Design a protein around this ligand. Structure first.
Ligand code: GLU
Ligand code: GLU
Ligand code: MG
Ligand code: MG
Lengths: 436, 436
């Protein structure tokens, strides 16, 4: 009995969980580099790193052919982005104390192997030193397919793939109503998160004119699968409408017979009808749908959980702060409403503007009769309220962004200040400044 | 059916484990201090620390009355030495990668709570700044009993209790023959470990004339229950002879009716006969025997496992190095024999001398036609051989002592060099230098 559109809707809806079952999934990506040369870490070094972590700390190996590309341990996964960015996808955890302990565990295991390899890790949103052609490409079929497709849909998507790092958080919803509310809160506030975590002002050894070049890159990666999703704020919005959106987003690939088939320029509607030209007659599974859902990259993404996709990679205290920010805003029901009331009369154009201007000016971005800084003050207060109300003593995790909001000065701006003062207008010291 | 001497022997013998079942138990102690004042951390702060770790990181509370004095999580325990020294007693682990991960986990959890309390931790062998009367006394009955007894048996035992920190390792034996061999290897080499980890040259803000004042303190704590145990090297030595030794060591207390009874100046032989004056008619259990065994403090201690008791507390890389040192020497059968051959013609006087002089001169201690440094070169080579042969890639854990052996310069000596140069003959910067 083949899958239908209605099944695809139900798949998203099956993510619905009672408040007591809500968890926090935190993912972050890091640039590996040779300590002596600063050169980006190569696949051969990455494979040694993965193999050694697996043996020392009891992880299961994830393979593509004879190539190790990741690790699994319970509900944690370690994986590789296209330019070797080294990712932890954490477990679904109950508290942010557990989240930060999980981040520390990972950083410890990584460094315990990498140190004798002469390898360091950098927490930034965009690779500050090296050109696109300097970046190692990982031996993964799905990335080869994507690398070929990116140039067809934008100028900066290859930089997304090879030269950016994010920290994100994955969160749960209890119902469609709850999902709609979190999606709208998450989208309206995403540019505030982008500003607070902005950490990518350098390209190839110089300032690039941005505070988050990473966030900027996502505005010219591919228009079919990015952005602020204004339709989410339409009264019609719901699981059904997100499915229709996703069905309109062209496919990258389908996994069949052990490998990723290039299905670029094709649609999941074709797949549903058994009429994918890359796979004539094959019918999709839930895994196929899940796979397709994971090729969509808006500022907030929906699957069986919701992803806040807004934020630059950063040092460990910000890795623990990102999930804390969103937990406080979205996991307290009153605070969630407060965000909705705060952002209720924001127009589609205003949201779009904030998303587009924040990468340049961060919290100094003008907004109405003031700066984005003033809105960030209100939102941070709310985030702290929600952590306090959770009763787990998690509010100290927002310490790492309290000073940013207070001063209106982003992390990227602090880096630029060092670059111009103490660093003698070189980015090389950032590899010590932001070393894990 | 009451316990007999033969049962007490069998209790030690029940520790015997097949090589595949051997594990590594690592314990270390740390001084807590207020970051601003450097004052030693008080019991009220300690209780908050313990309570917060328990709640955040899921530890079970260990109580004495309404007073929290420790935590339990599986086979790990956190506990308090008499002056508040903050101890982790780790799980029995298979590899040193696991050991060091365990140390990191603990340091992370401690710091994650202590930072907002304004509390730091110092890894040293002896409290470098404060007087004996400055040290908080923990509200534990068994320590109150001990504090009263110490002055009756030495001048420095109160300093042992209040002002020292160790890192130790607990290891397994397969049989009585194996136990005898490890005990003799462990005793003969203990002063080499003491020298390599020597990290206590300051008393009350000045140099005290030693490299390990901590190790020195153990030579005037109590002669009945300390030292190099020359009888271990007698041909008669075995489980039986250790039991006779322990039976000769006077008791501190017995736990009965929820509390520690003062049984100082009494013996376990009295207990065995039901003739303890502190507990007339009570007969001992295995727990009572275990309790008594844990009031014996030689350079190597025997219970159901063997403890290397030689080494000063220190920074995290030395916490992982201590257990690695002994694992390489004692857990490879060939290396174990090599240690025995190396130390075969060492006399009781020579061993005693090394134990007594190492606290003053470390690796510069004369020994025969050279310095202790030259013996340490041989022993470190052997330790590395044993780690290599284990096949777990654990040899990098001896990196933290390779330079000490090479140069013949102890950690204590490096501290003294800083004290006299950069620190302006104050010990206060050690609280930053050796901050966890
Ligand atoms: N590395 C991308 C995110 C890639 C992904 O996980 O989809 C970024 O910096 O935003
Ligand atoms: N704190 C003591 C060891 C105490 C014990 O655990 O018996 C030392 O520095 O050696
Ligand atoms: Mg990723
Ligand atoms: Mg102890």
């Amino acid at each position: 009995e083949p899958l239908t559109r209605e099944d695809l809707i139900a798949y998203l809806a099956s993510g619905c969980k009672s408040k007591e079952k809500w968890r926090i999934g935190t993912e972050h990506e890091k640039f590996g580099f040779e300590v002596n040369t600063l050169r980006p870490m190569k696949y051969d070094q990455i494979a040694e790193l993965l193999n050694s972590i697996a043996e020392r700390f009891e992880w299961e190996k994830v393979m593509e052919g004879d190539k190790i590309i990741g690790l699994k341990q319970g509900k944690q996964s370690i994986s590789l982005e296209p330019g070797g960015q080294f990712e932890l996808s954490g477990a679904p955890l109950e508290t942010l104390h557990q989240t930060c302990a999980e981040v520390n565990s990972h950083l410890y295991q990584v460094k315990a192997v990498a140190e004798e390899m002469g390898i360091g890790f950098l927490g930034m949103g965009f690779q500050p030193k090296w050109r696109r052609e300097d970046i190692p490409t990982m031996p993964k079929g799905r990335y080869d397919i994507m690398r070929n497709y990116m140039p067809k849909v934008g100028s900066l998507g290859l930089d997304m793939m090879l030269r950016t790092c994010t920290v994100q958080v994955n969160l749960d919803f209890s119902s469609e109503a709850d999902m709609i509310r979190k999606f709208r809160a998450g989208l309206a506030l995403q540019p505030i998160a982008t500003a607070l975590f902005a950490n990518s002002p350098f390209t190839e050894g110089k300032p690039n004119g941005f505070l988050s070049m990473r966030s900027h890159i996502w505005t010219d990666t591919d228009k079919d699968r990015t952005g602020m999703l204004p339709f989410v704020f339409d009264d019609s919005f719901g699981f059904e409408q997100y499915v229709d959106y996703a069905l309109d987003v062209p496919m990258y690939f389908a996994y069949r017979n052990g490998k990723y088939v290039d299905c670029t320029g094709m649609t999941f509607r074709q797949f549903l009808a058994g009429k994918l030209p890359c796979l004539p007659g094959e019918l999709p599974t839930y895994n196929d749908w899940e796979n397709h859902l994971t090729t969509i990259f808006p500022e907030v993404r929906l699957k069986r959980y919701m992803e806040m996709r807004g934020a630059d990679g950063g040092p460990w205290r910000r890795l623990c702060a990102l999930p804390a920010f969103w937990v406080g805003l979205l996991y307290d029901e009153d605070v969630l409403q407060s965000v909705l009331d705060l952002t209720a009369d924001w127009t589609p154009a205003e949201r779009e503007m904030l998303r587009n201007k924040v990468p340049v000016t961060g919290l100094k971005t003008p907004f109405r009769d003031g700066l984005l800084k003033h809105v960030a003050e209100d939102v941070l207060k709310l985030a702290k309220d929600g952590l306090e109300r959770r009763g787990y003593k998690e509010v100290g995790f927002l310490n790492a962004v309290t000073e940013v909001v207070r001063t209106g000065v982003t992390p990227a701006e602090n880096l630029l200040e060092m670059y111009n003062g103490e660093w003698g207008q070189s980015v090389d010291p950032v590899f010590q400044e932001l070393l894990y």
